[PDB]
Amino acid sequence: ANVREFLVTYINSEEYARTGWAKAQKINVGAARAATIISFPWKVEHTFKVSSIAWGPNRQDITESAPATFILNEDTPLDNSFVNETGIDVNYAFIKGSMKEGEIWKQTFLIDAATGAINIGLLDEEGKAPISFDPINRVVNVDGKVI
Amino acid sequence: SEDSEWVKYYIGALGPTIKFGGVPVGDYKIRISGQVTMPDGVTVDSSGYYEYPSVFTVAYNFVPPTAPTNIAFKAARIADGKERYDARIEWDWERGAGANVREFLVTYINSEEYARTGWAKAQKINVGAARAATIISFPWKVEHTFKVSSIAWGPNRQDITESAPATFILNEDTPLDNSFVNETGIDVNYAFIKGS
Amino acid sequence: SEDSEWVKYYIGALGPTIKFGGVPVGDYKIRISGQVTMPDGVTVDSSGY
């Protein structure tokens, strides 16, 4: 018969194994067939189940479907659609700041997350900042004066 | 309208119990007329016209339902690199003498903003038949006013049955189920910046 | 369908205003037939279809 809406319930896969759908999160969309989750956990699998409920004879009728699980990792293809060119980047890689002159971004500082190397100032022709920090070698090399 | 005519609605045998439909919703008068035919089949006797002195109104047997109750809250924390919290608000409703509730609409706004200007710029979230409302990235240590209204398709176009507003704040005192666990590279929290 | 039959939908007294339901949605033809009984109760006159 007619399906007036689809109800989707999701919960962590490990939590689903531990206690089922006790504290599961429910999201309904109605007549749409696309459910979107904002800021889904990374590299974490969750259990999702979909149930179709329509107004039955007395007050309601329920027709459920099989649960499913899915995880989001780098292997999962991404459409992005957000593109780029946003000032100040906060990622796993580094902390790089640039000022856009003309039509090109020139990095002003770079705080490496993996090694802690820090460059300060506009990079010269040789790719070395006027103030450079190399904690791997622990070298204070600055093209200037120290006070 | 006084110009309304005595529109035919049922013609047939006379009986103490008379049931018929097709009458539009409104206010109408009702009158009856009898008819008897003498065995010749050409001579017919009538009892005249009898009209009820009380005006009846066609309506719908539909009463607005009851109001939602049993306000409940749930909270969880996710720290996928960055600290964040997700809050779930739940409620329960009972059939009672009320009618069907097709959906529940929840409207929320900042508690201070609610005091300042009411629900002027309040944010509305609807779930339908579900009894659990989840907010992603709810503000920390900030109380907001939440109100729930039950709206069903009424007689003309809609029917509204609202419930009392409520407020809630999310702080460290609020228990957290988390469910996100841990072991995520690069931590961005109030504490420090540790890389391993 | 040309094989459709003249399904009964209302039998009763003749009147200028006739209202009845239960007809499924679709395309149908409509025909009427009259009936008059002579006072003997055994002789009945029809107006055809």
Q: Mark yes or no for CB contact B128/A113 under 8 Å.
A: no
State the burial class of residue B150 (Cβ atoms within 10 Å of its Cβ: 0-12, 13-18, 19+).
Answer: buried
Using DSSP, state whether A14 is helix, strand or coil.
Answer: helix
Taking alpha carbons only, the member of B151, B146, B121 closest to residue B134 is B146
Q: Mark yes or no for CB contact B128/A28 under 8 Å.
A: yes
Q: Can you tell me the distance from the alpha carbon of B143 to that of B171, in angstroms, rounded to the nearest whole number?
A: 9
- Name the closest residue on chain B to residue A60, using Cα atoms: B100
Which residue bears the tokens 């580094």?
Answer: A94
The residue among B11, B14, B43, B44 with the most chain C CBs within 10 A of its CB, best to mutate, is: B11
**What amino acid is encoded at B145 in this protein?**
T
| Number of residues in chain A | 147
Chain A contact for B66 (CB, 8 A cutoff): no
Q: How many CB atoms lie within 10 A of CB B158?
A: 9
**Beta-strand relationship, B123-128 and B159-162:** unpaired
CA Rg, chain B, in Å? 31
CA Rg, chain A, in Å? 26
> What are the C-alpha distances in Å from A57 to residues A66, B14, B61, B150?
24, 35, 17, 21
Backbone angles phi, psi at B23, to 5 degrees: -80, 125
Q: How many CB atoms lie within 10 A of CB B170?
A: 21
**What amino acid is encoded at A97 in this protein?**
G
CA Rg, chain C, in Å? 14
Taking alpha carbons only, the member of A141, B116, B62, A22 closest to residue A9 is A22
Taking alpha carbons only, the member of B68, B61, B59 closest to residue B151 is B68
**What amino acid is encoded at B23 in this protein?**
V
Which residues of A are less than 8 Å from B129 in CB distance?
A: 5, 7, 28, 53, 60
State the burial class of residue B116 (Cβ atoms within 10 Å of its Cβ: 0-12, 13-18, 19+).
Answer: exposed
Using DSSP, state whether B170 is helix, strand or coil.
Answer: coil
Give me the residues paired with residue A5 across strands: A53
Which residues of A are less than 8 Å from B177 in CB distance?
A: 23
- Name the closest residue on chain B to residue A51, using Cα atoms: B130
Taking alpha carbons only, the member of B154, B67, B169, B162 closest to residue B107 is B162
Q: How many CB atoms lie within 10 A of CB C33?
A: 10
Check residue B92 and report its DSSP letter: E
Beta-carbon contacts of A31 under 8 Å, excluding residues fewer than 6 positions away, are: A4, A5
Give me the residues paired with residue A112 across strands: A94
The C-alpha of B3 sits at a distance from chain A's nearest C-alpha, in angstroms, of 42
Residue C39 tokens, joined = 């006072």
Q: Can you tell me the distance from the alpha carbon of B90 to that of B104, in angstroms, rounded to the nearest whole number?
A: 11
CA dihedral A15, A21, A27, A33 (to 10 degrees): 100
Q: Can you tell me the distance from the alpha carbon of B133 to that of B71, in angstroms, rounded to the nearest whole number?
A: 11
Residue B89 tokens, joined = 């608000």
Beta-carbon contacts of B118 under 8 Å, excluding residues fewer than 6 positions away, are: none
Backbone angles phi, psi at B19, to 5 degrees: -125, 130
Using DSSP, state whether A15 is helix, strand or coil.
Answer: helix
Q: Mark yes or no for CB contact B180/A114 under 8 Å.
A: no
Chain B contact for A117 (CB, 8 A cutoff): no
Which residue bears the tokens 């109760």?
Answer: C41
Check residue B188 and report its DSSP letter: B
Residue B136 tokens, joined = 């992603």
Between CA C13 and CA C46, with CA C41 as vertex, the angle to 5 degrees is 55
The residue among A26, A62, A90, A92 with the most chain B CBs within 10 A of its CB, best to mutate, is: A26
Taking alpha carbons only, the member of B131, B76, B65 closest to residue B101 is B65
Check: CB of residue A43 under 8 Å from CB of residue A7.
Answer: no
Please name the method used to determine this structure.
cryo-EM
DSSP state letters, C1-49: -TT--------S---SS-----PPSS--------EEE-TTSS-EEE---
Q: Can you tell me the distance from the alpha carbon of B52 to that of B7, in angstroms, rounded to the nearest whole number?
A: 15
Q: Can you tell me the distance from the alpha carbon of B106 to that of C14, in angstroms, rounded to the nearest whole number?
A: 57
Helices then strands, each counted (H, E), chain C: 0, 2
Residue B53 tokens, joined = 């002195």
Q: How many CB atoms lie within 10 A of CB B93?
A: 19
CA dihedral B85, B180, B131, A50 (to 10 degrees): 140
**Which residue pairs, CB below 8 angstroms and at least 24 apart, start in A84-90?**
A90/B188
Taking alpha carbons only, the member of A21, A71, A72, A14 closest to residue A51 is A21
Which residues of C are less than 8 Å from B22 in CB distance?
A: 19, 21
Q: Mark yes or no for CB contact A25/B88 under 8 Å.
A: yes
Check: CB of residue B79 under 8 Å from CB of residue B91.
Answer: no
Residue B57 tokens, joined = 């109104």
- Residue B117's H or E segment, with its range, is helix B111-117
CA atoms within 13 A on the CB side of A120: 10
Which residue bears the tokens 């009845």?
Answer: C20
Separation of first and last alpha carbons in chain B: 85
Beta-carbon contacts of B133 under 8 Å, excluding residues fewer than 6 positions away, are: B88, B89, B90, B91, B106, B125, B127
Give me the residues paired with residue A52 across strands: A6, A63
For residues A59-81, one letter each, b for 16 or more C-beta atoms within 10 angstroms of the residue's C-beta and e for the rest, the string is: eeeeeeeebeeeeeeeeeeeeee
